[PDB]
């Protein structure tokens, strides 16, 4: 992501 998971 970071965001991602």
């Given at each position: 992501x970071?965001?991602?998971k």
């Open positions: 970071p965001g991602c």
